[PDB]
């Protein structure tokens, strides 16, 4: 198995540390975090070394084990939409 444990820092401060398969994709990681936080997956935004993680596998982005990630929620205001 060799789970890949990655630290997930949040701007607020809370740490949602979790371990994923070595082949886990960014979409899967976002889905797991959304399931944990009860937030739609489109709101959350994962970061890595000052670059947003768009989509694909985690490995080819340089995400190994013991790598720090940041979770920045989207901030939206308005009257509609």
């Amino acid at each position: 198995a060799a789970p890949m444990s990655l630290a997930i820092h949040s701007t607020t401060g809370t740490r949602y540390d979790l371990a994923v398969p070595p082949d886990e994709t960014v979409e899967g990681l976002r889905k797991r975090l959304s399931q944990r936080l009860k937030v739609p997956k489109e709101r959350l935004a994962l970061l890595h070394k000052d670059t947003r993680l768009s989509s694909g596998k985690l490995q080819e982005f340089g995400v190994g084990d013991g790598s720090k990630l940041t979770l920045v929620p989207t901030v939206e205001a308005g009257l509609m939409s």
Binding site: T11, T74, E76, G78, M80
Partner: protein, 283 residues
């Protein structure tokens, strides 16, 4: 498991000024930013600073464009002595009062999911005037009972506004009292802001201009005295109700005479006293 109504959100002077300046800059839009602070106890949410973030949107919505900026800013503030982390977000409602809309509630839901006690602050720039600033702090109510427990009168001192009640106050979210605790240096700097240079106090005023102003005001007072004589003859041939509407669209010689007297007295007394003080101080 309580969340009490005596809880307060402490907004620093710097945070308040930054919020108001950004909101006024973005007058048609709901410009927005993050609030940094600490969760001291269950009766305090200290807001010590706020920083705006790159955002773009229309007059109907505003959204942030990059989270890399937020992360990097947090890091580079920690590196200079602000380890505080995000405790909420602020956005401006220009003229609609203070309340949260649906998109605002969704954003606050995300922030609550991240941290339980995160708060949202709505500052309305244009409705703010010199003496008072229109600002409020909010948090959501789950799908349940009473949202909070009352162990004091501190919560029930604000008389929530009709606009907020219409838009969902006490039904989808509740308010939190805002307090403006300050430190000694902040107090001293705020007091010193308006202090003028010492030389300005002793500086005199061109005597030609002073005499010209005195002459102009006395000449005006002459005509005002004529009109005052005319007006005094009235007030006996006037209905008790007619007197009030008598001074509508027409000059009031008594009021203008009093104002001119006050201005003349102040100016002349100040000038004479300054002249004597200088006469002694400077040899």
């Amino acid at each position: 498991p309580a969340v009490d109504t005596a809880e307060q959100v402490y907004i620093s002077s710097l945070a308040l000024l930054k919020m108001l300046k950004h909101g006024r800059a973005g007058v048609p839009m709901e410009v927005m930013g993050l609030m940094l602070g600490e969760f001291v106890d269950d009766y305090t949410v200290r807001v010590i600073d706020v920083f705006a973030m790159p955002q773009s949107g229309t007059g109907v919505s505003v959204e942030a464009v990059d989270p890399v900026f937020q992360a990097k800013m947090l890091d580079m503030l920690k590196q200079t002595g602000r380890p505080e982390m995000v405790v909420g977000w602020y956005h401006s409602h220009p003229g609609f009062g203070c309340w949260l809309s649906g998109v605002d509630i969704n954003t606050q839901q995300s922030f609550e999911a991240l941290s339980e006690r995160a708060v949202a602050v709505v500052v309305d720039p244009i409705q703010s005037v010199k003496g008072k600033v229109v600002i409020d702090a909010f948090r959501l109510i789950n799908a349940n009972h009473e949202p909070r427990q009352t162990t004091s009168n501190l919560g029930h001192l604000n008389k929530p506004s009709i606009q907020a009640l219409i838009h969902g106050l006490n039904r989808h979210y509740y308010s939190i009292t805002i307090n403006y605790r300050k430190n000694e240096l902040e107090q001293k700097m705020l007091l010193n802001l308006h202090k003028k240079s010492w030389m300005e106090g002793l500086t005199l005023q061109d005597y030609s201009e002073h005499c010209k102003h005195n002459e102009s005001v006395v000449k005006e007072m002459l005509e005002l005295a004529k009109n005052y004589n005319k007006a005094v003859e009235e007030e006996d041939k006037m209905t008790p109700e007619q007197l009030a509407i008598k001074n509508v669209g027409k000059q009031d010689p008594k009021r203008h005479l009093e104002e001119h007297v006050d201005v003349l007295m102040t100016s002349n007394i100040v000038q004479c006293l300054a002249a004597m003080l200088d006469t002694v101080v400077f040899k």
